[PDB]
Amino acid sequence: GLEKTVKEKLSFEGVGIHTGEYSKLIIHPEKEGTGIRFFKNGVYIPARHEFVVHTNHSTDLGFKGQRIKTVEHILSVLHLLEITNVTIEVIGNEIPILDGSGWEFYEAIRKNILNQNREIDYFVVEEPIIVEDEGRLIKAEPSDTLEVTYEGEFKNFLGRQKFTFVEGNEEEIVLARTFAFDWEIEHIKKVGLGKGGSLKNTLVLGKDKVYNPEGLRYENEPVRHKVFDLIGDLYLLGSPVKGKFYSFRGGHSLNVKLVKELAKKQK
Amino acid sequence: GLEKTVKEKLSFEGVGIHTGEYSKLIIHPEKEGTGIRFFKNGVYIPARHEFVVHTNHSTDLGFKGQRIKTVEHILSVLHLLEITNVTIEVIGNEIPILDGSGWEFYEAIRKNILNQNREIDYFVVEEPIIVEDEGRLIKAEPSDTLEVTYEGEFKNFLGRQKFTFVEGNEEEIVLARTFAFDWEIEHIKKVGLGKGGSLKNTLVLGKDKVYNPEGLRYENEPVRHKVFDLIGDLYLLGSPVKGKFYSFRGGHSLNVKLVKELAKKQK
Ligand SMILES: O=c1ccn([C@@H]2O[C@H](COP(=O)(O)OP(=O)(O)O)[C@@H](O)[C@H]2O)c(=O)[nH]1
Ligand SMILES: O=c1ccn([C@@H]2O[C@H](COP(=O)(O)OP(=O)(O)O)[C@@H](O)[C@H]2O)c(=O)[nH]1
Ligand SMILES: CCCCCCCCCCCCCCCC(=O)O
Ligand SMILES: CCCCCCCCCCCCCCCC(=O)O
Ligand SMILES: [Zn+2]
Ligand SMILES: [Zn+2]
Ligand SMILES: [Zn+2]
Ligand SMILES: [Zn+2]
Ligand SMILES: [Zn+2]
Ligand SMILES: [Zn+2]
Ligand SMILES: [Zn+2]
Numbered sequence: 001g002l003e004k005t006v007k008e009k010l011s012f013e014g015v016g017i018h019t020g021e022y023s024k025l026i027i028h029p030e031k032e033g034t035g036i037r038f039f040k041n042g043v044y045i046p047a048r049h050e051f052v053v054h055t056n057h058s059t060d061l062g063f064k065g066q067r068i069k070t071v072e073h074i075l076s077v078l079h080l081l082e083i084t085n086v087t088i089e090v091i092g093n094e095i096p097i098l099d100g101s102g103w104e105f106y107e108a109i110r111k112n113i114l115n116q117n118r119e120i121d122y123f124v125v126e127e128p129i130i131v132e133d134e135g136r137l138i139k140a141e142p143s144d145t146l147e148v149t150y151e152g153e154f155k156n157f158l159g160r161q162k163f164t165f166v167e168g169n170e171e172e173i174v175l176a177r178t179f180a181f182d183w184e185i186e187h188i189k190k191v192g193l194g195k196g197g198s199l200k201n202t203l204v205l206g207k208d209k210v211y212n213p214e215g216l217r218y219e220n221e222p223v224r225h226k227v228f229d230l231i232g233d234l235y236l237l238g239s240p241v242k243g244k245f246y247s248f249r250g251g252h253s254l255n256v257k258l259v260k261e262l263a264k265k266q267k
Numbered sequence: 268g269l270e271k272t273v274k275e276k277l278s279f280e281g282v283g284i285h286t287g288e289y290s291k292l293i294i295h296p297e298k299e300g301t302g303i304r305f306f307k308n309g310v311y312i313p314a315r316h317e318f319v320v321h322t323n324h325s326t327d328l329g330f331k332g333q334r335i336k337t338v339e340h341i342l343s344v345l346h347l348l349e350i351t352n353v354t355i356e357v358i359g360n361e362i363p364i365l366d367g368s369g370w371e372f373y374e375a376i377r378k379n380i381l382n383q384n385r386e387i388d389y390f391v392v393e394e395p396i397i398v399e400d401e402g403r404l405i406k407a408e409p410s411d412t413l414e415v416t417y418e419g420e421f422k423n424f425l426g427r428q429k430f431t432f433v434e435g436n437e438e439e440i441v442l443a444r445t446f447a448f449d450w451e452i453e454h455i456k457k458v459g460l461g462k463g464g465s466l467k468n469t470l471v472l473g474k475d476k477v478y479n480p481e482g483l484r485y486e487n488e489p490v491r492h493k494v495f496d497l498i499g500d501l502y503l504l505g506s507p508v509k510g511k512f513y514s515f516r517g518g519h520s521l522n523v524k525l526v527k528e529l530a531k532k533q534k
C-alpha cells in the first residue's frame with residue numbers, strides 16, 4: 001500500500017481516562033517519510049517503542065520531560081487505516097478517551113485519507129517468536145497480512161473467549177470499548193490512575209454483572225478491545241505491521257515487551 | 268491454464284516517456300477472480316477497454332478523475348505471462364517507460380508467478396472480424412492459440428516488414444523498444460507528449476539513419492514492438508485472449524477500436 005496522511009487537520013477533545021483532565025488533539029498532515037509522531041510543548045515524541053515510559057493500564061510515551069498518556073487507541077486506528085505520516089499535536093497530558101473505543105477517530109480519519117507517493121515499508125515478522133510473563137503469553141509468526149488473535153480467560157461470566165482480527169475486519173474492533181472490573185477500581189484509583197473514568201467511557205464488569213445500562217456492544221467486546229489495544233501497541237514498531245499474532249491474557253506491558261523483542265531482532 | 272498472480276510485491280520506477288515525470292509501480296498479489304486493475308489515489312481502474320480515455324501515442328486509462336498513461340507495456344507483459352490477478356499501484360500519472368520495452372517487467376514477473384486455483388476463462392474470438400481506418404486495418408479470427416502478426420509499411424529504410432508472434436515466442440517481442448521518427452518529434456512534443464523521451468528509452472529513426480548508438484536490437488524491431496503493443500491492448504478485453512490477429516499499419520487507436528468491437532459482440 002501507499003503511505004497515507006490526512007487531507008486536512010482533524011481535531012478531537014475530551015477528558016483523559018486516567019488524568020481526569022481535559023485535553024485536545026490536532027492531527028496534522030505530513031509528507032512522505034515523516035512517520036507518526038506526537039508534539040507537546042515544543043517537543044516531538046515519535047510513536048516508537050524507544051519512547052515508551054509506562055505500560056500499566058495504558059501505553060505512555062515521553063521524551064525530553066514531555067509525557068503523553070494513553071496513545072494506544074489513536075495509534076491503533078492509525079495503524080488500521082495505514083496512516084503513516086502525521087504529527088499529533090497534543091494539548092494536555094493524555095489522549096482524550098472519548099467513548100472508550102476508536103470509533104470517533106476511525107470515522108473522522110477514514111474519510112480524510114490522502115494517499116501519497118511512496119510505497120509503505122512494512123515491518124515484517126521474519127521468524128517465529130514468543131514472550132511470556134506469569135501466565136500471559138504472546139506469539140508472533142510470519143504472515144502476508146496483519147492477523148491478530150486474542151484469547152482471554154476472565155474470572156467472571158466472560159469466562160474464556162477469543163477473537164481474531166484479519167485485514168478487512170477493521171470495523172469489528174474499532175467500537176469495542178475499554179473495560180474494567182469493579183474489583184479493580186479501587187486499585188486503579190489508588191495508584192493515581194482512572195481519574196477520568198466513567199460508565200460513559202468505560203465498560204464496568206462485575207463477577208456476574210454489567211453496570212453500563214447499555215450493556216455490551218458484543219458478547220466478547222472485551223477481547224475485541226484487547227485485540228484493538230494490541231494493534232495500537234504493534235504500531236510502536238515504527239511502521240504498519242505484517243504478521244500473525246496470538247496473545248493469551250496479554251496486556252500493554254507484554255505487548256510492548258514483544259515489540260522491543262521484534263525490534264531487537266533488527267527485523 | 269490456471270489463473271496466476273505474483274509471489275510477492277514487485278516494484279518498478281523511473282520516468283514516464285510522455286509526462287517526463289517520475290513514477291513508481293507496486294504490483295500487488297490478488298486472489299482468484301480479481302482480474303487486472305490499477306490503483307491511483309484511492310481509485311481502482313480496471314484494465315478494461317471501458318476505461319480507455321486516450322489512444323494517441325499511448326494507451327491511457329482513467330476513472331473518477333484519476334488517469335494513468337501508457338499502460339500498454341505492463342499489460343502486454345502481464346497478458347503474455349498470463350498473470351490474471353494483480354493490483355498495480357501507481358505513484359504518478361503514467362507507467363515508467365524504463366528502457367522502452369517490456370524486458371524488465373518480463374524478467375521480474377516471470378520469476379514470481381504464483382499459480383492459483385482457477386482455470387482461466389479466456390476471451391475467445393468466435394467469428395472473423397475486421398476494422399479499418401484510412402489504410403490501417405486489423406483482422407481477427409478464431410484460433411486455439413494467441414497469434415499476432417503485424418505488417419508495417421514505413422516511409423523510410425524499414426520499408427515493408429511483418430512479424431508474427433505465436434505462443435511460446437514471448438522472448439522475441441519483450442525486448443523490442445518503442446520507436447519514433449525524427450520528423451514526428453516536434454509534433455509529439457508540440458501536443459504535450461514525449462516530455463520524457465530519450466535515446467535511452469526510445470529508438471529514434473531517420474529517413475535512412477538510426478540515432479541510437481547501439482542501433483536496432485532486430486532489423487525489424489519496430490514491427491515486433493507493434494506486435495508487443497497490440498498484445499497489451501488486447502488484454503483490455505478483460506482476460507487472456509485466444510485468437511489469430513493480423514494488423515496492417517495499426518496503432519493503439521485501431522487496436523482499441525477492435526477491442527471494443529470484439530467486446531460489443533458479447534464474445
Ligand atoms: O485473559 C485475561 C486478560 C486480562 N484479564 C484482566 O483484564 C483487566 C485489564 O488489565 P490488564 O492486566 O490486562 O492490563 P492493561 O491491558 O490494562 O494494561 C485486568 O484486570 C486483568 O486481570 C483477565 O482477567 N484475563
Ligand atoms: O505501417 C506503419 C505503421 C506505423 N507507422 C508510423 O509509426 C509511427 C508511430 O505512430 P502511430 O501512428 O503508430 O501511433 P501509436 O501506435 O503510438 O498509437 C507513426 O509515425 C506512423 O506513421 C508507419 O510509418 N507505417
Ligand atoms: C482494567 C484496565 C484499564 C483502564 C482503566 C479504566 C479506568 C478505570 C476507572 C474506573 C471507572 C469507574 C466508573 C465510575 C466513575 C464515576 O462514577 O465517576
Ligand atoms: C510515436 C509514439 C511515441 C513517443 C516517443 C517519445 C518521443 C521523444 C523522442 C526522444 C527525443 C530525442 C531528442 C533527440 C532528437 C534527435 O537526435 O534527432
Ligand atoms: Zn503497495
Ligand atoms: Zn496497576
Ligand atoms: Zn488495566
Ligand atoms: Zn489501555
Ligand atoms: Zn484500550
Ligand atoms: Zn498525435
Ligand atoms: Zn505514436
Ligand SMILES: [Zn+2]
Pocket residue numbers: 324325326337339496519
Ligand atoms: Zn505506446
Ligand SMILES: [Zn+2]
Pocket residue numbers: 339340445492496
Ligand atoms: Zn509501445
